[PDB]
Amino acid sequence: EDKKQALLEAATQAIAQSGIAASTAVIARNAGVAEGTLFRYFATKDELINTLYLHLKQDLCQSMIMELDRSITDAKMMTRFIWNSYISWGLNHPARHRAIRQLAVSEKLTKETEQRADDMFPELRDLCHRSVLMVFMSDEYRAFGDGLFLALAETTMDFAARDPARAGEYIALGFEAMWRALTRE
Amino acid sequence: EDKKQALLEAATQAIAQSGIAASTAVIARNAGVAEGTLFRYFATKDELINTLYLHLKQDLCQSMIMELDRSITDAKMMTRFIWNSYISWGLNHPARHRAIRQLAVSEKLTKETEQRADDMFPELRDLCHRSVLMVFMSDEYRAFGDGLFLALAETTMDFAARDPARAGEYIALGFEAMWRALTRE
Ligand SMILES: C[C@H](CCC(=O)O)[C@H]1CC[C@H]2[C@@H]3[C@H](O)C[C@@H]4C[C@H](O)CC[C@]4(C)[C@H]3C[C@H](O)[C@]12C
Ligand SMILES: C[C@H](CCC(=O)O)[C@H]1CC[C@H]2[C@@H]3[C@H](O)C[C@@H]4C[C@H](O)CC[C@]4(C)[C@H]3C[C@H](O)[C@]12C
């Protein structure tokens, strides 16, 4: 029923379809509400980008909480579980993936948003006792590394969706491509 | 002036924007010509996909001919030159990249088209005396491996285009991600 969730869902769809340029008028209309109502929730496109990114990240991380087992010590096994979690989430919720990938490479996420993103799920930190995933790049390239992860993830989802009889095969082959590209031992 | 090239350019733009579903009416209109005229060049959407794919592949390969040096013996160095060639071509011709990537994962390329694609530029074969690039996957996954190459390439082009002061850095970091993902020694 509640208007914030309706606006966040409408913003998810609109950005998934149109990118960050998506219109607040269209988003407000697709929700129940007047555009003025939308502005009381997010006064700027910049704040909507930041709010929606944290919303989508929270949703993903909660799905990962449901799926992840902590008897796992092996970094590669833990990374595979994370990858499987992300692919499932984007196959279940294609617009949430499409939206988050455009928000992630928008140049509009604030340092406050990054810290709230890094903080929100302590349970998902570390899960490596020191880390393997994308720690080899300079800080300037962390967004680029995230973009490559998302590109490999999106291609894996596309083939698994089109050819579901081999979905697990695409997910495993995509994981090993991601692992080689974005880790070092 | 010539109508085939005008239609192939209009088909490139339309598929880049809309995918393989792009309308022959729109393509014909964006070219000089009546839709009936378009059908004398490609009687089906299937034949346009195949014809346009070979056209775009020929264009890419000719650009690679202009750029590539044959004193190169090292497989990694040769693969880097190929990658640099592809990224330059897609930054110079974004719609040609966007089109070819949708055609490549369309399920509509004919075996005849594949053989003509494999044959067209003997000069680009081998350039490895036995090969490293994507020879580790089963034949069923060659399209998937091509999709991962294209995804990594597209992300590299996006960041190089947005942040041209570091274009070479994104190209080098993207190459090493592609190389790790899609080769084995
Ligand atoms: C939750 C999990 C483990 C915790 C961590 O190491 O940060 C991490 C590792 C890689 C992360 C992902 C990658 O950084 C790529 C994406 C980046 C976006 O900014 C968030 C979604 C995105 C898909 C990330 C979600 C989540 O924070 C992931 C999946
Ligand atoms: C021309 C060059 C070397 C010759 C070869 O080994 O086939 C090859 C190696 C990898 C090839 C690319 C990859 O297979 C990924 C893409 C696949 C598409 O079907 C054609 C474009 C595409 C971008 C390919 C163009 C070209 O055939 C490439 C770049």
The domain limits of chain B are: 1-185
Number of residues that this document lists for chain B: 185
Q: Please give the method by which this entry was determined.
A: X-ray
- Measured from the alpha carbon of residue A56, the closest ligand is 1
Contact A173 B105 (CB under 8 A): no
* Shortest CA gap B41–chain A (Å): 30
* Shortest CA gap B70–chain A (Å): 28
Q: For ligand 2, atom 29, which residue shows the shortest CA distance?
A: B82
**Gap between the terminal Cα atoms of chain A:** 48
Q: What residue has token string 């909480």? A: A65
Dihedrals phi, psi of A73, to nearest 5 degrees: -100, -30
SS3 A133: strand
Q: What is the resolution of this structure in A?
A: 1.5
Name the DSSP letter for residue B132. -
Of A105, A141, A155, the CB nearest to B173: A141
A82 lines ligand 1 (CB under 6 A): yes
Report the phi/psi class of residue A134: left, alpha or beta, with left for phi > 0 and alpha for psi in -120 to 50: left
B143 lines ligand 2 (CB under 6 A): no
Q: Taking a C-beta distance cutoff of 8 angstroms, is the pair A56, A90 a contact? A: no
Contact A144 B137 (CB under 8 A): no
Separation CA A118–CA B100 (nearest Å)? 38
Spacing, Cα B153 to ligand 1 middle (Å): 21
Residue type, A152: L
Spacing, Cα B61 to ligand 1 middle (Å): 37
Burial group, residue A47, by CB count within 10 angstroms (0-12, 13-18, 19+): middle
Separation CA A140–CA A15 (nearest Å)? 25
Contact B173 A105 (CB under 8 A): no
Sign of CA dihedral B115, B157, A181, A89: negative
Q: Taking a C-beta distance cutoff of 8 angstroms, is the pair A69, A59 a contact? A: no
The CATH class that applies to domain A1-185 reads mainly alpha
